[PDB]
Amino acid sequence: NLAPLPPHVPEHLVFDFDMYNPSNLSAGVQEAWAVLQESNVPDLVWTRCNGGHWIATRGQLIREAYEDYRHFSSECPFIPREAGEAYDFIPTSMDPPEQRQFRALANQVVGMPVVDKLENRIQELACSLIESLRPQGQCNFTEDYAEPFPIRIFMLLAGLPEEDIPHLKYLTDQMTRPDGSMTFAEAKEALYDYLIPIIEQRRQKPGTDAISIVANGQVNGRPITSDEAKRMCGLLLVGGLDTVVNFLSFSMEFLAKSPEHRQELIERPERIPAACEELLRRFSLVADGRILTSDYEFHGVQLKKGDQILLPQMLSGLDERENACPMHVDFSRQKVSHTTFGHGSHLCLGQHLARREIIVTLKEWLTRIPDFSIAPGAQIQHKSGIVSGVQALPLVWDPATTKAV
Numbered sequence: 001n002l003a004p005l006p007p008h009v010p011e012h013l014v015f016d017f018d019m020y021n022p023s024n025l026s027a028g029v030q031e032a033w034a035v036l037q038e039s040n041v042p043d044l045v046w047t048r049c050n051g052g053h054w055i056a057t058r059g060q061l062i063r064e065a066y067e068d069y070r071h072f073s074s075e076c077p078f079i080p081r082e083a084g085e086a087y088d089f090i091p092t093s094m095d096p097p098e099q100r101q102f103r104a105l106a107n108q109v110v111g112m113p114v115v116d117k118l119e120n121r122i123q124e125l126a127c128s129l130i131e132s133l134r135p136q137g138q139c140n141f142t143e144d145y146a147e148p149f150p151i152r153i154f155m156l157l158a159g160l161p162e163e164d165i166p167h168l169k170y171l172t173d174q175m176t177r178p179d180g181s182m183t184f185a186e187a188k189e190a191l192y193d194y195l196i197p198i199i200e201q202r203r204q205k206p207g208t209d210a211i212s213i214v215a216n217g218q219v220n221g222r223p224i225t226s227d228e229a230k231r232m233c234g235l236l237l238v239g240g241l242d243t244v245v246n247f248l249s250f251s252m253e254f255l256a257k258s259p260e261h262r263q264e265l266i267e268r269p270e271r272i273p274a275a276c277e278e279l280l281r282r283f284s285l286v287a288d289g290r291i292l293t294s295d296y297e298f299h300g301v302q303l304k305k306g307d308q309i310l311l312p313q314m315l316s317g318l319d320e321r322e323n324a325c326p327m328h329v330d331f332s333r334q335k336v337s338h339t340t341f342g343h344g345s346h347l348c349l350g351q352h353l354a355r356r357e358i359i360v361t362l363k364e365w366l367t368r369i370p371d372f373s374i375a376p377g378a379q380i381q382h383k384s385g386i387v388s389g390v391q392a393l394p395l396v397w398d399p400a401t402t403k404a405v
């Protein structure tokens with residue numbers, strides 16, 4: 001239902017958008033959120049859904065809020081409030097100054113040097129998975145590639161057994177797109193329940209995997225605590241299991257639907273990195289937020305201490321003020337403006353790993369399976385939440401149009 005309108009919010013700003021089930025979802029999830037950028041819609045709106053909260057609807061306000069951590073705090077970043085309050089991942093639930101000291105440690109485990117360590121194996125797993133599918137003439141992309149490719153790279157990096165994936169994937173998805181069986185707090189505690197013994201084991205007997213590195217790490221020259229390590233590792237699991245996994249499906253759905261765009265990349269594969277950036281803009285997927293630390297007037301709107309404000313990345317990338325014809329995918333787009341990896345002091349530390357997985361996937365897929373389509377008659381369903389995704393993506397192709405490398 002709809003939470004009662006707080007007295008400080010005027011009626012003309014009320015737009016009852018539901019981030020977990022947006023009314024226009026059947027048009028595509030990005031399209032559903034873009035209803036907030038129609039002609040009659042102010043830059044900042046109040047929804048009475050999900051307990052009641054603000055939504056910033058334009059890149060300019062989104063970027064400003066991200067930059068101003070004094071007024072807009074990461075301490076309670078997720079909607080609904082109970083989820084934001086429970087959320088205590090590091091460094092995401094912290095503001096500067098305390099946040100910063102934890103970035104260097106996370107960078108040690110998912111940053112560029114690690115992407116270098118994993119380079120060959122990333123390449124090898126993409127090729128092996130795609131070659132196994134190639135002669136089939138069909139696949140269920142979400143389960144056959146989008147999930148196993150990034151997830152198996154992550155489990156390798158984290159030194160976790162692949163047999164644990166179904167359990168961990170289920171729990172991660174309850175934090176972002178809950179089925180209703182578990183509250184955010186329950187799902188998070190279950191992920192903690194998994195990590196707690198593994199962290200203790202690896203503090204006793206360190207390995208070289210990401211969990212060992214975090215758990216034995218130093219934070220500005222002092223030892224990390226067991227609790228801090230757990231809160232960092234929780235975030236890493238969500239990053240590994242529910243980010244690139246969804247993004248790959250949005251991208252492949254688009255490419256399946258656009259022979260012209262496939263052809264551009266088939267003919268000029270050196271454009272794949274630029275294509276990756278334009279796809280990251282167009283198929284952005286995270287709805288991050290903040291909590292007001294004081295009463296504050298922002299863009300003519302009175303915000304009250306404790307109000308939550310959603311800062312959806314879809315709305316920066318799809319903002320026509322920032323990107324002309326924003327629903328069009330243009331691989332030659334000149335100035336690709338987006339906040340898909342965040343903005344300000346919390347810029348995604350996994351972004352280098354993410355881009356490598358995306359770029360490798362596009363290159364290695366189009367090399368082997370240049371010509372593919374959505375299964376005839378299929379209707380692709382999206383799902384919305386803290387991270388949006390694609391429920392299923394049945395693809396088909398003629399094996400005679402494929403090439404084994």
Ligand code: 7HE
Nearest residue numbers: 091092110239240243244247340341342346348349350354
């Ligand atoms: C397993 C590592 C990993 C991977 C694969 C990702 N991330 Fe990233 N991320 C993102 C946002 C909006 C923010 C504030 C972060 C912050 C993060 C932070 C916290 C940065 C901070 O709060 O200081 C971490 C550790 C992080 N992200 C690890 C991470 C979005 C993404 C997106 C769109 C992708 C992929 C398409 C992504 N993350 C992959």
Ligand SMILES: CC1(C)[C@@H]2CC[C@@]1(C)C(=O)C2
Nearest residue numbers: 089092235238239286387
């Ligand atoms: C907001 C994120 C994308 C970032 C990594 C996974 C995620 C949902 C988090 O809890 C932090």
Ligand SMILES: [K+]
Nearest residue numbers: 075084085087
């Ligand atoms: K919190």
